[PDB]
């Protein structure tokens, strides 16, 4: 029901993660990461953040498009594989899906799982805070302070991007 | 002139898009410091109230702080109304 | 590579290391790590051989895995504490995860198979850079957070580094591989002394840095990469091999040479911390390092080897590369023992 | 009746897309001294229905080398996103009054390329793969300038909400303030919609049919649906951005009429340029942007970054 | 033209913001009364609900300090109906 | 409430149209009909072998270029701060560094396609 | 395990090129429908 | 220690496991790496949005910033392994073993 | 920091983002500003080794405010017991708790 | 461990002023002008005590003054205020921009019927000084006793006794 929403979207996130973590053909892995990123943007949206989710959306679609363009160019084969073609990728997909199935099973009944960290799974609506943002979204003023407060971050990120172009040039020079 | 003027003219001849982009960039870099309205902009951003002007306890002395919004003493933004 | 581009890439590597060693925010330390990783790959790819591509790859994916792991640790720490400051980890899982997250960067644990591979594949100069400069940053982070380490994990890491490095060095004739294993052993020594007194870690790191610099630039000036080629240097140029063997005796840590001073001081520290089995274990297993050090020294200077006739022309022509700071480096590499108490300057 | 609104934003849009084909085949034909479709009923007003009927009763063959799953999921993706990106448009009152409508539409426009991508790859053809890669290059090149130009233009808006554009252009069209960018923006709208003179993904002269070459009957008609809905939506977005229109709060029908007329004019200019140019050659449309559009749009981005500050004209965010 | 219009819009936004400022104290008073009333209702419900429990002394604070904490939205609407929690938590995020 | 109801409406309408397109027309399929189209004659045989893309450098730097727009996009909210001097300097810093990156690529072949 | 080359470069491997070869030929609108242009091309550069 | 955090952490765990296991290709491992990055972004965004750490919302943006840079460098490495190797598989990348 | 150049030059590069109680834009308070402020002001200059023993309940309150399940466990067991006993008719919710 | 003290339902039984948001927005400026004392006192109590469980009486008094203001505007200028707030309510964003004539009628009505003038631009956003008579909370955060600072390091420095004292190194 609409009670959880974030729970179901997190399960789709994990399923998309299993899809590309099973080492399928890189196009299919790209598709799996695409659905995972879309539902993750949905989670971030449902958790009171709009700019961050759409930024994940746009940036990851750009990156995954370039991954596709390289995949069918460089990292392809005469016989592309599917999630059911090979027994190894099928085994990885099966392991991931049944695993997350039993994790969420142990999660949503007991709701007190200890695994790694104590996970009291009552509901994500609970942890929300009663607050007032006035006439400014908190996330907007947050990422808008990069040009006013985080000048050092501006400098380091710009320098890293420029030198990243430089290295993308040098690595791909080929004598 | 001479070499510099010839180079400018040849760049206008060959690659006008680069000339236009560089001119626009240089203008947008160096004008904002010279233009006097920049400070005005800052003041406007300071004028816009997002949070409540939380009142302070009147323990006497301070004359400047108004005791009522209509009171004359205190900051005013008639300049923004006129401008 | 255009020389200006190489200079900029080196400056970016150094700036990433400096950002690691000067920032308090965790994100900034990771940014320094990222800049270091980003600028390191082209330096390896400078010579552009398939060996370089292989090594640069194996370098990349290991470092990327370690850095992503480091983010998992930072994010867990922030979730459980709400702080980005580099003080200590407030979640045991986060720190017992970052310990190996910062370990693959050093290459001491079973997360070490990448080190000999990258060392052998890439050129000798970039190998010097990788084995000397690329270890100050993760070691600096470990020094800052040493207050809240699980000593069992760190000591096990150090022991495995020492043991496998010393053993693997016994079975390679390529100089790059046995230097990688020696670097693993020295990583084990410093990481073992890390939890008790970080000043001794800094002292050992400095001694190792200068001494590996001296060793590697001697190798470059000899233009040797295999044991036979280095052995052949005696006919062309004997003083290089003469300094080679002394620097190798320092590699093994035989006193009164400089290399003893860390090995000595470390042993003095942990025995103050009621640790007795561990120092004895390391002292005995450093002999595996010493064995291939003496094997290299034997077939470099102590026994002159069959040379090649064309070296008659090689003697005819002198060197051109200056190899700056080399004569000073040898001096701090062999005789600084009488000035041992100067380690208090680090503290 | 929210369902009523949703259906009223789909069926009329599909009908408009259908009649877009007829108005194209008529306007184009009249450019070329022809008459265009004229036989079916009066003035060809039944051609869209006729070929709509054909394309959904003609046999939809599936190639033996295809990848079934993506071959089917691509048309659904294309049409679903083409229809979805109509919901945040501030037609008098937007159906979905989102705070980040511009970013949302950018995201879905970037997603729409994946329909082309998967359809081209799954079809297992030389021509289809060629067209898919040309689409890759075209949309990345033009997406960079799309994002930069959108930022530059919206710097005077104050936020990314589409409705405030109407408030922004209360007294003057935005094109009088950013006419250079507008030109570039228009070209980008020509290329992202994969239309002329950048319609190299299809490339009828050199790629037979591009990524639609193995797409027959219903799926082909559906990809055409996505393409033409994207054409009309892009022209609508351009009209909303630059050519603002008066909006009486009491009679939104006036703004509806003005907005619809502006979208119609922009679409007519699309067909106009489609019938008045040769076709670009792959790298050129890349070398057009990475060497002429990108520097100019960067310079204009700095100019519009500085402009509110130097004149004390920073727009409000609320 | 854009300069003049944007300056006028800035003045209008200042006017609207000062109106919101003038009105905020009533909203603050009403909001604090509503949250206190809701907490009281939850405490009274907890008194009856936690009776046969081994040891669930009601109205107990979690933080060792006595300064009030902005109550989490779960402990403000835990016993409320489904529509109440849906509208309270995913209300502004879902209103488009 | 509204956005996923919308998205669902579009996806089910599309899947339906696909269903009527694929089940109604009474297809008759044979092997040569679904044979790959290669301008008539039978294809040489490939359609999945590596297809060289010479803008690989251009394609990858698109990733960095589109990445920077993430830093760039907070500008409409960044202009409305009390430190306009620092904001202007940093925005011009980003734009100048992007210009420098593009110029470095342009001069060092870069944007020019491989042959 | 033969020792690495003296120049530390592996010899350049054999050719691995798989350039496309499509029938720019019949039924193609550009090829007039009665041409069969078999073009050995790498990507787009013929 | 709430629930959504469990799902994102578990997703990161499977992505870490997937990265640390190769089957044939180099692109798939890189995709698994960017999935790890995605999980990191979602987790950090959840944390800072929940805690109202307004000044820290730039942190996921910087995460993505360096994310794309690493992805680019890795796929350029794959370009070179393809140029010198024809393909991208890792099991044939063995020339450095001796 | 290892080599704290920031204090030497008196230049702020990352200290503004280190803690939640710093000067946020538009004076937006953090969710747990009060607890973080109390904990930080507690163990300042006292020593990072004395902080654990001395400023313990302050940090415990802060970490609770961050994660909140000495409070959310309370809620979970409250809801569990309510749904348990309501099933067989021991308790019925009051009208204001369902409308 | 402790008591979450909550005032009983009787204290927070205010008269609960009932006007819609549009009605409130219509009378925003005049209300802020002629009701500033209760709002300011209540908010200073809220910010100082940092405990809404304590300043409930100011929350009562602000509502009383707001109801008095609305009763006055009902008694003197009902018709112009009704038309003005309806015209404000029509707008989706409740902008004052479209509704200026009705604003003029309302302003002149309250000016010549209740002696009111709308605050000028920015007047309603100036920090005010209140003359509240409550004491200043000594420990608003209820902070416990701070740990004693570490023993301060002081004293003249002399050379290290017998040098380094590190093994055989005498000096
Ligand atoms: C601890 C205390 C003790 C240690 C103190 C520090 C000692 C430093 C020793 C430096 C030795 C330099 C040397 O001989 O290098 C030879 C070697 C190259 O030898 P080569 O193959 O004959 O050179 C051919 C040219 O490079 C061919 O060049 P090209 O034509 O390809 O163009 C590129 C050229 C460009 O050169 C220039 O522009 C000049 O690059 C160089 O010349 C390389 C050096 C650049 C230095 C830049 C310094 C910036 C500041 O370069 C390096 O190994 C450089 C490594 C990076 C810098 C040294 C870092 C070592 C120390 C790290 C730890 C520091 C202490 C930590 C605690
Ligand atoms: C992620 C989850 C991926 C699950 C999976 O195995 O997808 C395989 C699916 C089909 O692989 P394929 O390479 O087209 O091969 C299909 C036949 O094996 C080869 O072609 P076919 O002609 O044999 O196709 C008919 C075939 C396979 O069924 C289909 O083609 C129907 C559509 C896919 C159903 C699964 O029907 C059956 O095997 C019997 C079905 C009763 O590939 C996908 O990428 C589907 C992913 C869907 C994700 C959710 C999208 C929303
Ligand atoms: C203990 C240090 C020495 C350990 C043994 C060294 C290796 C065995 C000795 C013979 C090495 C081969 C050789 O040729 O030795 C002589 C060599 C220089 O030979 P030559 O060129 O004839 O000298 C001209 C000087 N005007 O010159 C040398 O070998 C110089 C040896 C220097 C050793 C390092 C000293 C460091 C400081 C103490």
Swiss-Prot record, chain A:
InterPro entries: ComplexI_Subunit6, NADH_UbQ/plastoQ_OxRdtase_su6, Nuo/plastoQ_OxRdtase_6_NuoJ. GO terms for cellular component: mitochondrial inner membrane; mitochondrion; respiratory chain complex I. It is found in: Mitochondrion inner membrane. Pfam families: Oxidored_q3 (PF00499). The gene is MT-ND6. It is an enzyme of class 7 (translocase). The keyword Coiled coil does not apply. Its main location: mitochondrion. Its EC number is 7.1.1.2. This is NADH-ubiquinone oxidoreductase chain 6. It comes from the Eukaryota. Core subunit of the mitochondrial membrane respiratory chain NADH dehydrogenase (Complex I) which catalyzes electron transfer from NADH through the respiratory chain, using ubiquinone as an electron acceptor. Essential for the catalytic activity and assembly of complex I. Gene3D superfamilies: NADH-ubiquinone/plastoquinone oxidoreductase chain 6, subunit NuoJ. GO terms for biological process: mitochondrial electron transport, NADH to ubiquinone; mitochondrial respiratory chain complex I assembly. It comes from Sus scrofa (Pig).
Swiss-Prot record, chain C:
Its main location: mitochondrion. It is an enzyme of class 7 (translocase). Disulfide bonds: none annotated. It is found in: Mitochondrion inner membrane. Keywords: Electron transport, Membrane, Mitochondrion, Mitochondrion inner membrane, NAD, Respiratory chain, Translocase, Transmembrane, Transmembrane helix, Transport, Ubiquinone. It catalyses: a ubiquinone + NADH + 5 H(+)(in) = a ubiquinol + NAD(+) + 4 H(+)(out). It is a multi-pass membrane protein. Its EC number is 7.1.1.2. Core subunit of respiratory chain NADH dehydrogenase (Complex I) which is composed of 45 different subunits. Interacts with TMEM242. Core subunit of the mitochondrial membrane respiratory chain NADH dehydrogenase (Complex I) which catalyzes electron transfer from NADH through the respiratory chain, using ubiquinone as an electron acceptor. Essential for the catalytic activity and assembly of complex I. Belongs to the complex I subunit 2 family. This is NADH-ubiquinone oxidoreductase chain 2.
Curated annotation (Swiss-Prot), chain F:
The chain crosses the membrane at residues 3-23, 55-75, 86-106. It is found in: Mitochondrion inner membrane. It catalyses: a ubiquinone + NADH + 5 H(+)(in) = a ubiquinol + NAD(+) + 4 H(+)(out). Keywords: Electron transport, Membrane, Mitochondrion, Mitochondrion inner membrane, NAD, Respiratory chain, Translocase, Transmembrane, Transmembrane helix, Transport, Ubiquinone. It comes from the Eukaryota. It is an enzyme of class 7 (translocase). Its EC number is 7.1.1.2. GO terms for molecular function: NADH dehydrogenase (ubiquinone) activity. GO terms for biological process: mitochondrial electron transport, NADH to ubiquinone. One of its GO terms (cellular component) is respiratory chain complex I. It is a multi-pass membrane protein. Belongs to the complex I subunit 3 family. Core subunit of the mitochondrial membrane respiratory chain NADH dehydrogenase (Complex I) which catalyzes electron transfer from NADH through the respiratory chain, using ubiquinone as an electron acceptor. Essential for the catalytic activity of complex I. Core subunit of respiratory chain NADH dehydrogenase (Complex I) which is composed of 45 different subunits. Interacts with TMEM186. Interacts with TMEM242. This is NADH-ubiquinone oxidoreductase chain 3. It comes from Sus scrofa. The gene is MT-ND3.
Swiss-Prot record, chain H:
The keyword NAD applies. It is a multi-pass membrane protein. InterPro entries: NADH_UbQ_OxRdtase_chain4L/K (IPR001133), NUOK/Mnh_C1-like (IPR039428). One of its GO terms (cellular component) is respiratory chain complex I. The keyword Transmembrane helix applies. Coiled coil: none annotated. Signal peptide: none annotated. Its EC number is 7.1.1.2. Core subunit of respiratory chain NADH dehydrogenase (Complex I) which is composed of 45 different subunits. This is NADH-ubiquinone oxidoreductase chain 4L. It comes from Sus scrofa (Pig).
């Amino acid at each position: 029901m609409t009670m959880y929403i974030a729970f179901i979207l997190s399960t789709i996130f994990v399923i998309g993660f299993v899809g590309f973590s099973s080492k399928p053909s890189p196009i299919y892995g790209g598709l799996g990461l695409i659905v995972s990123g879309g539902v993750g943007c949905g989670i971030v949206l449902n958790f009171g953040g709009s700019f961050l989710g759409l930024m994940v959306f746009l940036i990851y679609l750009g990156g995954m498009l370039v991954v596709f363009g390289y995949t069918t160019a460089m990292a392809t084969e005469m016989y592309p594989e599917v999630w059911v073609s090979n027994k190894t990728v099928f085994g990885a997909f099966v392991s991931g899906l049944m695993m997350e199935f039993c994790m969420v099973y142990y999660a949503l009944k007991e709701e007190e799982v200890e695994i790694i960290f104590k996970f009291n799974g009552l509901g994500d609506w609970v942890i929300y805070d009663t607050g007032d943002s006035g006439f400014f979204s908190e996330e907007a003023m947050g990422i808008a302070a990069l040009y006013s407060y985080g000048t050092w971050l501006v400098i380091v990120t710009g320098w890293s991007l420029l030198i990243g172009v430089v290295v993308i040039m040098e690595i791909t020079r080929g004598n | 002139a001479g070499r510099i003027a010839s180079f400018l003219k040849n760049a206008w001849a060959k690659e006008p898009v680069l000339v236009a982009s560089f001119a626009i960039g240089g203008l947008a870099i160096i004008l904002p410091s010279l233009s006097p309205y920049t400070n005005y902009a800052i003041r406007i951003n300071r004028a816009t109230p997002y949070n409540y002007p939380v009142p302070l306890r009147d323990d006497g002395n301070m004359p400047d702080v108004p005791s009522h919004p209509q009171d004359p003493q205190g900051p005013s933004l008639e300049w923004l109304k006129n401008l | 590579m255009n020389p200006i581009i190489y200079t900029t890439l080196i400056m970016t590597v150094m700036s990433g290391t400096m950002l690691v060693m000067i920032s308090s925010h965790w994100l900034l330390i990771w940014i320094g790590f990222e800049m270091n990783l980003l600028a390191m790959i082209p330096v390896l790819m400078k010579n552009f051989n398939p060996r370089a591509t292989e090594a640069a790859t194996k370098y990349f994916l290991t470092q990327a895995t370690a850095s992503m792991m480091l983010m998992m640790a930072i994010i867990i720490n922030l979730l459980y504490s709400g702080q980005w400051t580099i003080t200590k980890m407030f979640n045991p899982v986060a720190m017992t995860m970052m310990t190996m997250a910062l370990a693959m960067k050093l290459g001491l644990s079973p997360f070490h198979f990448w080190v000999p591979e990258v060392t052998q594949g890439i050129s000798l100069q970039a190998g010097l850079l990788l084995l000397t400069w690329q270890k100050l940053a993760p070691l600096s982070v470990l020094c800052q957070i040493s207050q809240s380490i699980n000593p069992n994990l760190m000591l096990t890491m150090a022991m495995l580094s020492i043991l496998i490095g010393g053993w693997g060095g016994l079975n390679q004739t390529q100089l790059r591989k046995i230097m990688a294993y020696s670097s693993i052993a020295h990583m084990g020594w410093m990481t073992a002394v890390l939890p008790y007194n970080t000043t001794m870690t800094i002292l050992n790191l400095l001694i190792y840095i200068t001494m590996t610099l001296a060793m590697f630039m001697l190798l470059i000036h000899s233009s040797a990469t295999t044991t036979l080629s280095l052995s052949h240097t005696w006919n062309k140029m004997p003083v290089i091999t003469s300094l080679m063997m002394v620097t190798l005796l320092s590699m093994g840590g035989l006193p009164p040479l400089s290399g003893f001073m860390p090995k000595w001081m470390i042993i003095q520290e942990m025995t103050k911390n009621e640790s007795i089995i561990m120092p004895t274990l390391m002292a005995m297993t450093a002999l595996l390092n010493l064995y291939f050090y003496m094997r290299l020294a034997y077939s470099s200077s102590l026994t002159m080897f069959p040379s090649t006739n064309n070296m008659k022309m090689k003697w005819q022509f002198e060197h051109t590369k200056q190899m700056k700071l080399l004569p000073t480096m040898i001096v701090l590499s062999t005789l600084v023992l009488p000035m041992t108490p100067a380690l208090s300057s680090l503290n | 009746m929210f369902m009523i609104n949703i259906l009223s934003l789909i069926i009329p849009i599909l009908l408009a897309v259908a009649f877009l084909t007829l108005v194209e085949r008529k306007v184009l034909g009249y450019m070329q001294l022809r008459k265009g479709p004229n036989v079916v009923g009066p003035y060809g007003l039944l051609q869209p229905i006729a070929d709509a009927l054909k394309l959904v009763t003609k046999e939809p063959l599936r190639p033996g080398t295809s990848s079934i799953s993506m071959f089917i999921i691509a048309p659904i993706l294309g049409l679903s996103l083409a229809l979805t990106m109509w919901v945040p448009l501030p037609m008098p009152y937007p159906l979905i009054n989102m705070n980040l409508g511009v970013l949302f539409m950018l995201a879905m426009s970037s997603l729409a390329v994946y329909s082309i991508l998967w359809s081209g790859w799954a079809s297992n053809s030389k021509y289809a793969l060629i067209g898919a890669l040309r689409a890759v290059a075209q949309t990345i090149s033009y997406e960079v300038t799309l994002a930069i130009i959108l930022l530059s233009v919206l710097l005077m808006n104050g936020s990314y909400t589409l409705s405030t554009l109407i408030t922004t252009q209360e007294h003057i069209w935005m094109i009088f303030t950013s006419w250079p960018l507008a030109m570039m923006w228009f070209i980008s709208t020509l290329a992202e919609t994969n239309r002329a003179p950048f319609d190299l993904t299809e490339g009828e002269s050199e790629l037979v049919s591009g990524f639609n070459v193995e797409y027959a009957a219903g799926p082909f008609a559906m990809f055409f649906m996505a393409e033409y809905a994207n054409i009309i939506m892009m022209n609508a977005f351009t009209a909303i951005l630059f050519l603002g229109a008066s909006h009486d709060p009491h009679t939104p029908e006036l703004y509806t009429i003005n907005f619809v007329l502006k979208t119609l004019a922009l679409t007519i200019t699309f067909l106009w340029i489609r019938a008045s140019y040769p076709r670009f050659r792959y790298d050129q449309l890349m070398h057009l942007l990475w060497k002429s559009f990108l520097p100019l749009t960067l310079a204009l981005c700095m100019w519009h970054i500085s402009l509110p500050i130097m004149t004390a004209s920073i727009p409000p965010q609320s | 033209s854009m300069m003049k219009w944007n300056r006028e819009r800035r003045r209008l936004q200042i006017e609207d913001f000062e109106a919101r400022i003038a009105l905020m104290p009533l909203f603050q008073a009403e909001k604090d009364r509503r949250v206190l009333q809701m907490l009281r209702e939850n405490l009274e419900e907890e008194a009856i609900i936690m009776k046969d429990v081994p040891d669930w002394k009601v109205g107990e604070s979690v933080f060792h300090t006595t300064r009030w904490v902005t109550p989490m939205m779960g402990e403000l609407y835990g016993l409320r109906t489904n529509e109440e929690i849906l509208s309270a938590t995913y209300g502004f995020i879902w209103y488009t | 409430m509204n956005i996923m109801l919308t998205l669902l409406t579009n996806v089910t309408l599309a899947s339906l149209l696909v269903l009527i397109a694929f089940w109604l027309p009474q297809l008759n399929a044979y092997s040569e009909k679904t044979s790959p189209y290669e301008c008539g004659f039978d294809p040489m045989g490939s359609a999945r072998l590596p297809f060289s893309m010479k803008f690989f450098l251009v394609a990858i730097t698109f990733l960095l270029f589109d990445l920077e727009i993430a830093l760039l996009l907070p500008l409409p909210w960044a202009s409305q701060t009390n430190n306009l001097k620092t904001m202007l300097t940093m925005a011009l810093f980003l734009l100048i560094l992007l210009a420098a990156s593009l110029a470095y690529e342009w001069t060092q072949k870069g944007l020019e396609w491989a042959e | 395990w033969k020792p690495p080359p003296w120049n530390d470069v592996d010899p350049p491997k054999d050719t691995l090129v798989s350039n496309l070869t499509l029938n720019f030929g019949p039924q193609h609108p550009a090829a007039h429908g009665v041409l069969r242009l078999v073009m050995e091309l790498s990507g787009e550069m013929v | 220690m709430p629930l959504v955090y469990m799902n994102i952490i578990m997703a990161f765990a499977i992505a870490l496991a997937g990265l640390l296991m190769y089957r044939s290709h180099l692109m798939s491992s890189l995709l698994c790496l960017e999935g790890m990055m995605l999980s990191l972004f979602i987790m950090s965004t959840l944390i800072i949005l929940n805690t109202h750490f307004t000044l820290a919302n730039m942190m996921p943006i910087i995460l993505l910033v360096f994310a794309a840079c690493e992805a680019a460098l890795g796929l350029s490495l794959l370009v070179m392994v393809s140029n010198t190797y024809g393909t991208d598989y890792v099991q044939n990348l063995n020339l450095l073993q001796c | 920091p290892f080599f704290d150049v920031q204090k030497r030059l008196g230049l702020d590069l990352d200290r503004w983002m280190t803690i939640q109680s710093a000067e946020q834009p538009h004076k937006i308070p953090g969710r747990c500003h009060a607890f973080e402020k109390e904990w930080i002001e507690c163990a300042h200059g006292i020593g990072g080794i004395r902080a654990e023993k001395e400023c313990k309940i302050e940090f415990d309150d802060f970490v609770e405010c961050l994660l909140r399940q000495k409070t959310m466990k309370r809620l979970s067991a409250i809801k569990r017991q309510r749904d348990k006993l309501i099933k067989e008719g021991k308790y019925t919710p009051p009208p204001h708790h369902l409308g | 461990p402790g008591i979450v003290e909550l005032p009983t339902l009787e204290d927070l039984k205010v008269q609960e002023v009932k006007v819609s948001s549009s009605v409130l927005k219509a009378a925003a400026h005049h209300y802020g002008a002629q009701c500033d004392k209760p709002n300011k006192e209540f908010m200073l109590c809220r910010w100082e005590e940092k405990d809404p469980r304590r300043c409930l009486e100011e929350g009562k008094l602000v509502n009383q003054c707001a109801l008095d203001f609305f009763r006055q505007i009902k008694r003197h200028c009902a018709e112009p205020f009704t038309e003005y707030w309806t015209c404000i309510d029509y707008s989706g964003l409740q902008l004052f921009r479209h509704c200026r004539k009705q604003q003029a009628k309302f302003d002149e009505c309250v000016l010549d019927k209740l002696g009111w003038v709308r605050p000028d631009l920015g007047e309603l956003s100036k920090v005010t000084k209140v003359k509240t008579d409550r004491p200043l909370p000594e420990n608003p955060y209820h902070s416990r006793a701070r740990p004693e600072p570490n023993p301060e390091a002081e004293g003249d420095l002399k050379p290290a006794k017998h040098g380094s004292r590190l093994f055989f190194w005498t000096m």
